[PDB]
Amino acid sequence: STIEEQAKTFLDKFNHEAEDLFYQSSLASWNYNTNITEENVQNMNNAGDKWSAFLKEQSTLAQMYPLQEIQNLTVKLQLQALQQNGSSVLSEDKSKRLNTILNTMSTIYSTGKVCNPDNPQECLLLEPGLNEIMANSLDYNERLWAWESWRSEVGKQLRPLYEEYVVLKNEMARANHYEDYGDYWRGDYEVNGVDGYDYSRGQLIEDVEHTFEEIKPLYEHLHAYVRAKLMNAYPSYISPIGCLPAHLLGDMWGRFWTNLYSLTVPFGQKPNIDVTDAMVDQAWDAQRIFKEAEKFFVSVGLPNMTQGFWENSMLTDPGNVQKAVCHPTAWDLGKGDFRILMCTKVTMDDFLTAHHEMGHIQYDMAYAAQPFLLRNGANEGFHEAVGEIMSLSAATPKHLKSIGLLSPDFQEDNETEINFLLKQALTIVGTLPFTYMLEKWRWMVFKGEIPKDQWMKKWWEMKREIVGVVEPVPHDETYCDPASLFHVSNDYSFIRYYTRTLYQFQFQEALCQAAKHEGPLHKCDISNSTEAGQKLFNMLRLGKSEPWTLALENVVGAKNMNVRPLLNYFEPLFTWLKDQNKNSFVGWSTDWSPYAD
């Protein structure tokens, strides 16, 4: 009858129709994901386009409802979500031009390959082949050539596309009354009108800078230690006071630093924390790993999994004619259909990834009772943070002792403790400066603090300044290295991983608060105690009905982003880093480079 009653009517019809429509879209997606074939991708763009067009066409009706009339916040956020046109509100030529340029990126970067200079037959793509060698190879020339060729073959093909991309994306942001696409990213945490649970857009930059100022000394010490260990592993290559080459960090761009463990192991004469060999010993398959993950979920208080997951989802690499992608992805589909794609091997990393995606789908099942477009995280980072909570809790020795591997007489000396702390710290720390530099660099590229012919010089200068990484060879304006990364060329922001990392230790402390935790934060396991279960569940289901601020103050009792849980987690390891690097230099020099000498 009234404005809000008919708004609720339209939004509930939207729920009851978008349920089936997005379920059909995700069914086509899942058919493509479990079977890569042209018929599957032709199914994928039918219902997916029908879903995007459904959103636009029902936004043309939701925009007729004025937004500044609903006093409530539950349905006002639904109206906000439906009234957001997405990426279809521009001029007719330029909107489709930006879309087809993004599609061209997603094609060329993913299907690109590099070829042997002396043999134009040896050609291989990025994953696998290039990431496995630059994670374990000891050859400078091989890693350097792969690192150069991946950014040469497709980085050039992405540079003019990125040049058009920044302009068209900024035009789209301006058409949606945003400052830039950096402001669009800052607009993901944009709650309004609450007066106390509110959060601005520039405050995202404020918080990121202020909470990375504390990371900077810890990351400086870790960078000093990894440079010393790279001296140990790759002698006569790097300056003792300089930065690090970009092809010695385990991955393509220096994002993940876990692979350095084989060459940055503190005390190798001690039992290994990696339990992949133990998992091979008992001849486990994927099914046993996933069932043990579900059992650990039951132990902390989260429910079992439904029939659809074990009846529909793909769990092992096919290999045969029904070839399919194997990236670990959680899939929210509605109708009780919450799926996971992982081609799982017998690996400890795969065990923690299984826990990661189990946590994602448990989060999805918890918030499944939400309205359809509120069937998502309160913000972007909480999904990833909740997923990583289970990996972080399961990685502790307190969980491996209860798994069944690692016979239950495990010592508690500081040696393996420090080893595990450093092994986790490589990834946890070294992903933060890269996130900071990438997010700020893209923010100011979209904002305009970099002239369009200065992208690479500043990008690598702040790889040196923030991350302490030097490109081994000079780069002209021809290439595009940031666009040669998965998240830049596939429309994904990167600050969500920073939020994941900080909320990860925040939720660690929160879940150890009620779990009668006795030692420091590193040994804490959330297993066998269900109180952490409901303490995380009073998070696990709110969705976008309430802001992340109310949810975060209910979880940890804090109002703003904080990394102090991480600092206290690594503080004994921080002292260990300070003690070990007394014969080396703590810091990095941005003037040194392998091509500058």
Which residues are part of the catalytic machinery? 357, 487
Q: Return binding residues.
A: 151, 255, 327-328, 356, 360, 384, 459, 463, 497
Give the single-character DSSP code of 464.
Answer: I
Q: Return binding residues for Zn(2+).
A: 356, 360, 384
Nearest in space to 204 (alpha carbons), one of 529, 507, 561: 561
Three-state secondary-structure class, residue 105: helix
Q: At 497, list the tokens.
A: 């991983």
Task: Pick the closer one to other proteins by CB: 119 or 307.
Answer: 307
Nearest in space to 87 (alpha carbons), one of 491, 566, 506: 491
Q: At 38, list the tokens.
A: 């042209």
Peptide bond connecting 160 to the previous residue in cis, omega within 30 degrees of 0: no
Binding of other proteins at residue 37 (CB under 8 A)? Answer: no
Q: Which stretch binds other proteins (CB under 8 A): 3-11, 172-180, 233-241, 576-584?
A: 3-11
Q: Return binding residues for substrate.
A: 255, 327-328, 497
Q: Which stretch binds other proteins (CB under 8 A): 199-207, 335-343, 351-359, 561-569?
A: 335-343
Binding of other proteins at residue 335 (CB under 8 A)? Answer: yes
Rounded to whole angstroms, the Cα distance separating 51 from 20 reads 10
Question: Which residue bears the tokens 């990236």?
Answer: 327
Residues 174 and 524 sit within 8 Å (Cβ to Cβ): no
Q: State which of residues 225, 261, 331, 338 lies at the interface with other proteins (CB under 8 A).
A: 338
Non-local CB neighbours of 377 within 8 Å, separated by 6+ positions? 363, 367, 383, 543, 544
Q: How far is CA 304 from the centre of its chain?
A: 26
Alpha-carbon distance values, 393 to 47, 268, 390, 521, 554 (Å): 38, 24, 5, 10, 20
Binding of other proteins at residue 311 (CB under 8 A)? Answer: yes
Least separation in angstroms between CB 380 and other proteins:
24
Binding of other proteins at residue 86 (CB under 8 A)? Answer: no
Chain positions 406 to 425 lying near other proteins, rule: CB under 8 A, are none
Rounded to whole angstroms, the Cα distance separating 39 from 36 reads 8
Give the single-character DSSP code of 261.
Answer: G
Q: State which of residues 55, 158, 195, 337 lies at the interface with other proteins (CB under 8 A).
A: 337
Three-state secondary-structure class, residue 459: helix
Least separation in angstroms between CB 384 and other proteins:
23
Size of the site for other proteins (CB under 8 A): 29
Query: How does DSSP assign 437-451, residue by residue?
Result: HHHHHHHHHHHTSS-
Least separation in angstroms between CB 325 and other proteins:
19
Single-letter amino acid, residue 521 = L
Q: State which of residues 53, 61, 89, 194 lies at the interface with other proteins (CB under 8 A).
A: 61
Q: Return binding residues for chloride.
A: 151, 459, 463
Residues 149 and 118 sit within 8 Å (Cβ to Cβ): no
E strand or H helix at 571 = helix 564-580
Q: State which of residues 71, 269, 307, 320 lies at the interface with other proteins (CB under 8 A).
A: 307
Gyration radius of the chain's alpha carbons = 24
Binding of other proteins at residue 127 (CB under 8 A)? Answer: no
Q: Which stretch binds other proteins (CB under 8 A): 7-15, 81-89, 260-268, 428-436?
A: 7-15
Binding of other proteins at residue 308 (CB under 8 A)? Answer: yes
Rounded to whole angstroms, the Cα distance separating 455 from 544 reads 36
Binding of other proteins at residue 453 (CB under 8 A)? Answer: no
Q: Which stretch binds other proteins (CB under 8 A): 22-30, 86-94, 111-119, 477-485?
A: 22-30
**Pattern 368-407, other proteins, x by CB under 8 A:** x---------------------------------------
Q: State which of residues 109, 199, 212, 309 lies at the interface with other proteins (CB under 8 A).
A: 309
Q: What are phi and psi of 93, to 5 degrees?
A: -70, -45
Binding of other proteins at residue 24 (CB under 8 A)? Answer: yes
Alpha-carbon distance values, 535 to 122, 249, 269, 526, 532 (Å): 54, 37, 40, 11, 5
Q: Which stretch binds other proteins (CB under 8 A): 66-74, 156-164, 305-313, 380-388?
A: 305-313
Task: Pick the closer one to other proteins by CB: 114 or 330.
Answer: 330
Rounded to whole angstroms, the Cα distance separating 416 from 521 reads 15
Chain positions 129 to 168 lying near other proteins, rule: CB under 8 A, are none
Least separation in angstroms between CB 25 and other proteins:
13
Strands 113-116 and 119-125: antiparallel
Task: Pick the closer one to other proteins by CB: 137 or 312.
Answer: 312
Q: State which of residues 334, 387, 533, 594 lies at the interface with other proteins (CB under 8 A).
A: 334
Task: Pick the closer one to other proteins by CB: 10 or 351.
Answer: 10
Q: How far is CA 106 from the centre of its chain?
A: 18
Task: Pick the closer one to other proteins by CB: 308 or 328.
Answer: 308
Q: State which of residues 157, 238, 258, 312 lies at the interface with other proteins (CB under 8 A).
A: 312
Chain positions contacting other proteins, by CB under 8 A: 1, 5-6, 8-10, 12-13, 16-17, 19-20, 23-24, 27, 61, 64, 306-309, 311-312, 334-338, 368
